[PDB]
Amino acid sequence: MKQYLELMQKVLDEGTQKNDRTGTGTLSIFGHQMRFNLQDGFPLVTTKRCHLRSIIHELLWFLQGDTNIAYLHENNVTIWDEWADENGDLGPVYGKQWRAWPTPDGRHIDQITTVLNQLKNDPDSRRIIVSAWNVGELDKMALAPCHAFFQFYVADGKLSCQLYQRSCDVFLGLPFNIASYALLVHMMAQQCDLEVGDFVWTGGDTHLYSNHMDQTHLQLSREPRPLPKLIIKRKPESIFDYRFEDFEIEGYDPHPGIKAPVAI
Amino acid sequence: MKQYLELMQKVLDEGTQKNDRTGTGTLSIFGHQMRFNLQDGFPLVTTKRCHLRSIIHELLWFLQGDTNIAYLHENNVTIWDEWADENGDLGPVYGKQWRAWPTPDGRHIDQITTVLNQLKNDPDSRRIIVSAWNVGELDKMALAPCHAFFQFYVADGKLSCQLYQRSCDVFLGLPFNIASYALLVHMMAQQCDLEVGDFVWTGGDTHLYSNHMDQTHLQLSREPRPLPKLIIKRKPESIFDYRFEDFEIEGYDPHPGIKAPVAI
Ligand SMILES: C#CCN(Cc1ccc2[nH]c(N)nc(=O)c2c1)c1ccc(C(=O)N[C@@H](CCC(=O)O)C(=O)O)cc1
Ligand SMILES: C#CCN(Cc1ccc2[nH]c(N)nc(=O)c2c1)c1ccc(C(=O)N[C@@H](CCC(=O)O)C(=O)O)cc1
């Protein structure tokens, strides 16, 4: 997409060679924002083929409040393999925080149910947020949430959502998250009888790993193709009842996929 | 400031009429980001006279981990009176969440010290964040946090900061928060022997209350003056040992102040 590619070029031209946790090295910029009008099409990268099966199953895995990769495996998704323990657990990551944020007094908070109820009863609320940044549980998580916090908004019957991504792997992780949240907005809109609006991406440490330089240069040479469209074949009783079979991405003509090594 | 005035005009030009909790009515836009290079000067609004006293004392109050207005009153700061209970208490807001975020296992985390440790021992970390958005304590708070989350970043010996403000009252609150955060960055940098970089502001529901329109346009008819300069007359042993009297704002020649009704 034009926005995605311009961010890449931005990282190349302005990035600061930074040493990273993995000891790999990354070109990095701090602070960036982009807007994606969902009414223009699904923001799935066209300059490289993206794998939707992983994107869809991971999201349904989140909404279930699951933190064990068993479900992912059952559906051939291996993205979380390198971080799960001997038993497949990842600690209280996203899923747990979205559906069961633990209070100090022992209670748990369902942030998705709360959001649904706010969108339906109080759409003008400026407090429609879901946060995965639970400071008290960070040390138990296999990894600290990269897509840490997000906020919904309703204006003129349209549903918007801003995502704050503290750490962003521009090449691999980014295309995945854009598509993931764009999908959530669609599922939320359908459930709350609202039209889809803007999906705004905001990041902190936006970086490109040194061992992805070639792949980047390659992708940067491809002319972006028109954006596909999403079809939701069925309307479930709740945002928690969607199935992989319910989605379809029409008009998706991407350039060949580009393979790149994963940084653990 | 150029960036500030530009946001105001954006809100006016692309805003959407939206009702709000206070029952006042607002003009709102969702998603914005602006950058301030702290090297250029202290980011304090010059198109209207601002009251540094209230800003500085609030920050020191915050860092103390205090959440009772008694301190503020001793120094004639009344900016938090409308929300305090009979005993002057506001609940576990800012100060508390920063100095002692409660965990589910009976621990408490001092996010300020943690961040200081990272800035000195692991400045390349992508996890240097302080969150006030404690989902499990919101009901105890007098008001849900506006400036809910912030991230620090280091590069070329310069410290930068990005803040995510979920709800922003452009006319009243914004000028306070920007001056407040720039102050924090200067304090952090001095404690970590770093120079000041950029303050990146990101807002969710960015709005102007309908009863501030005239005051807004009055302010917009004004030419911003040169940015003041901040002089810190001492290097305390710790970030929590700063006093009001250590800060000097020099060259601050603002246009007349404009009064405007608060929305409780
Ligand atoms: C981000 C994220 C989610 N995930 C996993 C995952 C890994 C690290 C994380 N790190 C942090 N901090 N938070 C996360 O949510 C997170 C999630 C991803 C995993 C792999 C690829 C990847 O290798 N990309 C291939 C996948 C191909 C396939 O699955 O068939 C690609 O080319 O798209 C991308 C994203
Ligand atoms: C942000 C913030 C802190 N605050 C208060 C305050 C109020 C509501 C909030 N709401 C939420 N949710 N979070 C907050 O941080 C927050 C803070 C402010 C309060 C009042 C003025 C105000 O009345 N402005 C006068 C100041 C006069 C003076 O102090 O001398 C003016 O005319 O400018 C400014 C800032």
Residue among B21, B35, B136 minimizing CB distance to A102: B136
Longest Cα–Cα distance in chain A: 55
Q: What angle do CA A110, A113, A114 make, to 5 degrees?
A: 80
Provide, as residue numbers in chain B, all residues whose Cβ is less than 8 Å from the Cβ of A153: 30, 204-205
- Residues within a 6 A CB radius of ligand 2: B 51, 54, 79-80, 143-147, 172-173, 176-177, 259, 262
Six token digits for residue B255: 């246009």
Return the residue matching tokens 């709740």.
A238
Assess contact for A191 and A116: CB atoms under 8 A.
yes
Query: Do B222 and B8 contact (CB within 8 A), yes or no?
Result: no
Q: Are strands B26-37 and B195-209 parallel, antiparallel or unpaired?
A: antiparallel
SS3 of residue A262 by DSSP: coil
CATH of the domain at B135: 3.30.572.10
Nearest alpha-carbon partner for B70 in A263, B61, B10: B61
| Separation CA A52–CA B110 (nearest Å) | 40
Q: Give me the phi and psi of A204, to 5 degrees please.
A: -105, -90
Distance of CA B86 to the CA centre of its chain: 26
Q: CB under 8 Å to A227, separation ≥6 — which residues?
A: A1, A40, A41, A42, A43, A44, A46
Q: Are B111 and B130 in contact (CB under 8 A)?
A: yes
- The position carrying tokens 């959440």 is B67
Nearest residue of B to residue A202 by CA position?
Answer: B202
What backbone torsions phi and psi does residue A247 show, to the nearest 5 degrees?
-110, 150
Tokens of A237: 């009783």
Give the Cα-Cα-Cα angle A70, A74, A76 (nearest 5 degrees): 110
Burial B72-107 (b: 16+ CB within 10 A, else e): beeeebebbeeebeeeeebbbbbbbbbbbbbbbeee
Minimal CA separation from A43 to chain B, in Å: 18
Residue closest to A85 by CA, chosen among A64, A69, A100, A66: A69
Amino acid at B180: S
Q: Return d(Cα A8, Cα A14) in angstroms, integer.
A: 10
DSSP B162-198: EEEEEEEETTTHHHHHHHHHHHHHHHHHHHTT-EEEE
- CA-based nearest residue to B252, from B224, B216, B215, B217: B224
Distance A80 CA to ligand 1 centre (A): 7
Residue with the smallest CA separation from ligand 2 atom 25 is B172
Q: Which residues are CB-contacts of A126 (< 8 A; sequence separation ≥ 6)?
A: A153, B20, B21, B166, B167, B204, B205
CA A42 to ligand 1 center in whole angstroms: 19
Give burial (CB, 10 Å; 0-12/13-18/19+) of B243: exposed
Give CA A114 to chain center in angstroms.
20
Per DSSP, the three-state class of B7 is helix
| Residue B52, Cβ density class (10 Å: 0-12 exposed, 13-18 middle, ≥19 buried) | middle
Shortest distance, CA B44 to any CA of chain A (angstroms):
21
Q: Do A202 and B144 touch (CB under 8 A)?
A: no
Q: Which of B212, B165, B168, B204 is nearest to A154 (CA)?
A: B204
Dump the DSSP string for B67-125: -BTHHHHHTT--TTGGG--TTSB--S-HHHHHH-EEPTTS-EE-HHHHHHHHHHH-TT-
* Token digits of residue B123: 């400045």
- Is residue B119 part of an annotated ligand binding site? no
- What distance lies between CA B74 and its chain's CA centroid? 21
Question: Which residues does A217 contact at the CB level (< 8 Å), separation at least 6?
Answer: none
Tell which residue, A53, A108, A112, A103, has the closest CA to residue A78: A53
Category of A39 on φ-ψ map: left (φ > 0), alpha (ψ -120 to 50) or beta: alpha
Q: Return the closest-CA partner of residue A246 out of A50, A63, A1.
A: A63
Residue B8 has a CB neighbour count (10 Å cut-off) of: 21
DSSP B218: H
Q: How far apart are CA B14 and CA A36, in angstroms?
A: 16
Helix A173-191 × helix A2-14 angle, to 10°: 140
Residue that is written with structure tokens 């800060």 in the block: B247
HSE (side-chain half, CA atoms, 13 Å) at B163: 24
Cβ pair B46, B251 in contact under 8 A: no
Q: Which residue of B has its CA nearest to A169?
A: B126
Nearest chain A CA: its distance from B112 CA (Å): 12
Catalytic status, residue B192: no
Residue B130 to residues A134, A242, B99: CA-CA distances in angstroms?
A: 11, 35, 10
Give the Cα separation of A171 and A258 in Å (integer): 10
Work out the number of other CB atoms within 10 angstroms of the CB of residue A107: 11
**Closest ligand to Cα A146:** 1
How many CB atoms within 10 Å of residue B229?
A: 13
Q: Which residue's structure tokens are 């009772």?
A: B68
Q: Are B61 and B43 in contact (CB under 8 A)?
A: no
Q: Helices in A75-130 by DSSP H: which ranges?
A: 94-100, 111-121
> How many other CB atoms are found less than 10 A from the CB of residue B256?
9
CB B239 within 8 A of CB B63: yes
CA distance B56 to B35: 22
Pair of tokens at residue B209: 């209350």
Q: Rounded to the nearest whole angstrom, what is the distance from the C-alpha of residue A220 to the centroid of ligand 2?
A: 46
Do the annotations mark residue B168 as ligand-binding? yes
Contact A33 B202 (CB under 8 A): yes
Q: Which residue has its alpha carbon closest to ligand 1 atom 24?
A: A172
CA–CA gap between residue A96 and residue A183 (Å, rounded): 20
* Residue B116 contacts residue B239 (beta carbons within 8 Å): yes
Q: Are B109 and B96 in contact (CB under 8 A)?
A: no
Sign, CA torsion B2/B6/B8/B12: positive
User: What b/e string do you get for A163-189 counting C-beta neighbours within 10 Å, with b at 16 or more?
Assistant: bbbbbbbbbbbbbbbbbbbbbbbbbbb
Q: Compute how many other C-beta atoms are within 10 angstroms of the C-beta atom of residue B180.
A: 18
Q: Which tokens is A240 given?
A: 């928690």
- Take residue B243 and report the two structure tokens written for it: 């006093």
The closest alpha carbon to B179, from B230, B233, B250, belongs to B230
Q: Which amino acid is at B9?
A: Q
Exp. method: X-ray
Sequence-distant (6+) residues with CB within 8 A of B241 are none
Taking CA–CA distances from B167, the nearest residue in chain A reads A126
- Ligand 1 surroundings by CB, under 6 angstroms: A 50-51, 54, 79-80, 143-147, 167, 172-173, 176-177, 262
Give the CB-side neighbour count of residue B70, counting CA atoms within 13 A: 9
Ligand having the closest approach to the CA of B147: 2
DSSP state of B228: P
Runs of H (alpha helix) within A29-172: 52-63, 70-74, 94-100, 111-121
CB A188 within 8 A of CB A239: yes
Q: Give the number of residues written for chain B.
A: 264
Considering its fold, how many domains does chain A have in total?
Answer: 1
CA A145 from chain center: how many Å? 11
- Residue B94 CA to ligand 2 center (angstroms) comes to 14
Coil, helix or strand at residue A33? strand
Question: Do A264 and A82 touch, CB atoms closer than 8 A?
Answer: yes
Q: Which domain holds residue B227?
A: 1-264
How many angstroms separate the CA atoms of A98 and A130, rounded?
A: 7
Which residue is it, tokens 């040479």?
A221
**H/E/C letters for each residue in A162-227?**
EEEEEEEECCCHHHHHHHHHHHHHHHHHHHCCCEEEEEEEEEEEEEEEHHHHHHHHHHCCCCCCCC
3-state secondary structure at position B256? coil
User: Measured between alpha carbons, how far is B136 from B66 in angstroms, rounded to an integer?
Assistant: 19
